[PDB]
Design a protein around this nucleic acid. Structure first.
Ligand code: MN
Ligand code: MN
Ligand code: MN
Ligand code: MN
Ligand code: MN
Ligand code: MN
Ligand code: MN
Lengths: 105, 82, 94, 99, 97, 106, 85, 99
DNA sequence: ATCAATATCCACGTGCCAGTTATACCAAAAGTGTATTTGGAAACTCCTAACTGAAAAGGCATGTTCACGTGAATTCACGTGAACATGCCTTTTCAGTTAGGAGTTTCCAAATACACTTTTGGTATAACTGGCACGTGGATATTGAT
DNA sequence: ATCAATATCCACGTGCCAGTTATACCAAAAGTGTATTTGGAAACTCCTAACTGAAAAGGCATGTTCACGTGAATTCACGTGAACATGCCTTTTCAGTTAGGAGTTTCCAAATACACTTTTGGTATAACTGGCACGTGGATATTGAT
């Protein structure tokens, strides 16, 4: 009498992923392994971004992640920036970057 | 004062946006060119957002309507639903 | 009499596992919810097309896996495939 | 007696100020006034969720800031420091938003 | 053993070509282009209609979903004429029963 | 005397086949009867628009048979078809003749 | 059995690159352009071939099909007409 | 006495010639090797439908021609008529292929 | 270089509100266990087309020479943006009306589901020919020297 | 301007093959008809949250002065285009070979379909506090004049 997330070792809702797959018109049938795999992938990527965003918050001497820290975490990592290249993070701002030829002296 | 709403997007506000974009020197003709760009961008997104509203038989453009519209235009936006 | 799902509960759980003494603002949580739904639809959408391409009716974990290799860049794909095979193994034997 | 910073010094200070921050840079009321006007040509008697307008403003300002980056590169590519309309036009053409 | 039937739109594209240019033919490579075009536009429209039904928690794609998808995907004049052709085809299909 | 749904709708495009592909494509649980009709009309329409413009280009090139080059000239020279197919490559289609003015002599 | 394949990016000849620039309306070509183009083409080909072979593997096939290339081109936003559905 | 067209005349003639035609401008067999070299260094023991190789060559030449158009606009924007690597790089950076 | 004006840190104090914590319903999932159905992996064998190899030719690639126009460097004039202090009106921040979003409910038109019948699209063979590709010579247009 | 060299346009005739055409075979869709189920348009009512209004807050418009970035002009070294000789390797057409794609059939592990049990995540109300925004002084850095 345990949930599939606990049986899979996941902080993410395996049962909810399964419902969203069937109700999403993705295929006629969904295997028992797909919602586990997909929940694990989503949990991994959330951990990846939250880890890097936690560092960005610590470096701003802040204890609570805000959208700025998520923006800094993504645009500074080569692969998350590739994965989210066409995505806009609200209240995220831009990375500090001044073209060299615009500096004086 | 009778002035247009696209002139409501003011010269110092356009100057601020260029600064965040890292621009040091701004020609005077940029401000009229920018408003033309902004208007085109909003028309394309609001047209699609309103189309979603009409289909849902509503009179209130929702933030999801805007989000679904931006996604269609390849301007995926995070933090306003879904 | 209205309910709305989200991932905030599971996102916060993952946050404590990686940074126990770190919070997260509401705006930051809304962005994390958008992120999960985005990556969900991309992976599931790709898996759907894979099944259709090969005249299959079932999105199995092999479809999710190939979709992951197609959608994630290099090293993220390696570790996501790994964490994915790990969860299905532990789920099968238990 | 009055102090004057040299041209370009304040502008570089503005760049650093606004690249550090995240607040919206267009004033809300002119923008919301512009959104309702544009939508009126598509459908009449329209209402907007407050977050719908905020969504539009975040997307629009992000679009314009990103375009100014590409525009700035086009000016610098021409061995200039001033962005000009032909810079914006060139960036939008290569982006495939035009021609 | 018989090789399975590969469907295409070529029969239908050729009819339309004859209504429009009765003295004009088409090469196989050009016909191949047209089959790609029709399948591309089909999946675009059907795909956008699929998201419309889901966004409004509807389990059925109707003529109304298809019309809104046409308005979203096609530019101005192309959509105006495509809407009229579709609205006209459906009313004709309904009354003809 | 049965009649196909195409004829019943006034269409040259196969309504029945379109209906099958809507169900087989996993787009929704159910398909209304009007959806394949409407969608087949739209597809037939767009096919007519391209074939008209391409047929003209084939005539301008003194050919009687449409080839990919003609479909390319037809699409790239029509602003709305160009926008619809701006992210598309037409094999054997080539490009529109276009030379930047600053590149011409004198 | 087959001879080792190496350095085939140089089979994209200097005249071939010139011809492509011509179709693109280019009048004068710097000497450095040619190796820059090979690098660009190689990156482009790799990304497409990578996705194509991934589609091939998933179908437990040893033959890369035109459909594999078309699907690969589609998901990179370079839709191709004239080689299958 | 020996005839010489001036620098630019033949180049413009070739532009008109190749913009007029549709055939592939890269040799078939050298391109097929390149595909096989790349694919095999990603996975061994692969075969190719001949149509798959033509599909790849049509894609690459279409991609390169389009990139050369954008490259040419960047050079002209810098008041040159000669495409240089920095033109290609700027084109791809604004396209987001490198950014 | 010596200054002074202004911007920028830094370390610290402040109150407030959005976040964390906890609790109680509770319906809506999610799970469990059963009966039941089926996709597609597995055998096998058919057969397409990918690969190999020969061999000849001529269409291009290569590398060289040579001239010259292009890009780059430098100078200079002038006009246009940047900086700034000013005068103040527009945006921002608050209140109490309702528009309409969203829930709930009924029930009919409209969808799915079965079996059975009809025909239409695709394959294939044989057949066929006219459209186009190719080669020629011949009158016309264009380019570069003068 | 005249002129000549060269490319280009166009009509011409050629053989050939891809496109067109027409035969039959036929399985696989499509159409028709029946009984069955259900999604969701329609009433209505509820209750947010979008709108309006008014009063306060601070950003923007304006005009002046001038630093200096831009575009125009002019030089020039040399990299790039044009032309040509040389010959190599692509291209072309045929052949034989078998890998592996694809078609068919069997049948079982894993899917869905219920009904039923169990609990989880969402809501809500009340409470709570510390994380963060914001204001402070005062020490230093920066900047621009001299
Ligand atoms: Mn290798
Ligand atoms: Mn020059
Ligand atoms: Mn009302
Ligand atoms: Mn028939
Ligand atoms: Mn040689
Ligand atoms: Mn075998
Ligand atoms: Mn709970």
């Amino acid at each position: 009498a345990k949930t599939r997330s606990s049986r899979a070792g996941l902080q993410f809702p395996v049962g909810r992923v399964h419902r969203l797959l069937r109700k999403g018109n993705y295929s006629e049938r969904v295997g028992a392994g797909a919602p586990v795999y997909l929940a694990a992938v989503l949990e991994y990527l959330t951990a990846e971004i939250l880890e890097l965003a936690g560092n960005a918050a610590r470096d701003n001497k802040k204890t609570r992640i805000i959208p700025r820290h998520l923006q800094l975490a993504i645009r500074n990592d080569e692969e998350l920036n590739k994965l989210l290249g066409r995505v806009t993070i609200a209240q995220g701002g831009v990375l500090p970057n001044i073209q060299a030829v615009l500096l004086p002296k | 004062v009778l002035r247009d709403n696209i002139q409501g997007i003011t010269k110092p506000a356009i100057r601020r946006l260029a600064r965040r974009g890292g621009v040091k020197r701004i020609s005077g003709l940029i401000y009229e060119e920018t408003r033309g760009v902004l208007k085109v961008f909003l028309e394309n997104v609001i047209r699609d957002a309103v189309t979603y509203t009409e289909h849902a038989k509503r009179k209130t453009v929702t933030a999801m309507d805007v989000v679904y519209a931006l996604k269609r235009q390849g301007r995926t936006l995070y933090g306003f639903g879904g | 009499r209205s309910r709305k799902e989200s991932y905030s509960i599971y996102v916060y759980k993952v946050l404590k596992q990686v940074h126990p003494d770190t919070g997260i603002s509401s705006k930051a949580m809304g962005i994390m919810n958008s992120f999960v739904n985005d990556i969900f639809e991309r992976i599931a959408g790709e898996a759907s097309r894979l099944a259709h391409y090969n005249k299959r009716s079932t999105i199995t974990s092999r479809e999710i896996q190939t979709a992951v290799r197609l959608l994630l860049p290099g090293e993220l794909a390696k570790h996501a495939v790994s964490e994915g095979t790990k969860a299905v193994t532990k789920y099968t034997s238990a | 007696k009055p102090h004057r910073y040299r041209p370009g010094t304040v502008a570089l200070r503005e760049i650093r100020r606004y690249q550090k921050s995240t607040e919206l840079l267009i004033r809300k009321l002119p923008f919301q006034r512009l959104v309702r006007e544009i939508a009126q040509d598509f459908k009449t008697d329209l209402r907007f969720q407050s977050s719908a307008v905020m969504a539009l403003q975040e997307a629009c300002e992000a679009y314009l800031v990103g375009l100014f980056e590409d525009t700035n590169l086009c000016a610098i590519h021409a061995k200039r420091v001033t962005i000009m309309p032909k810079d914006i036009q060139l960036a939008r053409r290569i982006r495939g938003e035009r021609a």
